[PDB]
Amino acid sequence: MQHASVIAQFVVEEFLPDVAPADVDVDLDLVDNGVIDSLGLLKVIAWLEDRFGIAADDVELSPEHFRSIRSIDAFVVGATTPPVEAKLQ
Numbered sequence: 790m791q792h793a794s795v796i797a798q799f800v801v802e803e804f805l806p807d808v809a810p811a812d813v814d815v816d817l818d819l820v821d822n823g824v825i826d827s828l829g830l831l832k833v834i835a836w837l838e839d840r841f842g843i844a845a846d847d848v849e850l851s852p853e854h855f856r857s858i859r860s861i862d863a864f865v866v867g868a869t870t871p872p873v874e875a876k877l878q
């Protein structure tokens with residue numbers, strides 16, 4: 790989307806950064822990577838407030854949000870909206 794490539798690249802960088810994140814089928818449900826739901830979610834929540842200065846907003850949890858990468862892209866777009874770039878080079 791406007792910056793969905795950064796989300797996949799940013800999220801994947803924590804797990805497999807030595808591999809091109811754009812070379813990963815972003816059409817795969819990241820549920821398998823649910824690992825970020827807890828370990829990464831805590832690091833991302835604290836990091837998000839550390840860099841962007843946004844409240845963790847962990848009052849409500851939505852496990853269904855990790856069902857697909859696109860679902861997460863909408864959450865970031867609604868909260869923040871970075872520059873728009875072409876996902877495919």
Ligand SMILES: *[PH](O)(O)OCC(C)(C)[C@H](O)C(=O)NCCC(=O)NCCSC(=O)c1cccnc1
Nearest residue numbers: 823825826827828830833837850851852854865
């Ligand atoms: P664990 O066993 O993974 O804990 C499971 C649950 C589902 C409770 C998980 O910890 C949780 O709280 N997830 C709820 C949904 C959630 O908070 N997901 C965050 C969306 S990503 C968003 O916060 C964000 C931050 C930084 C960059 N992009 C998006």
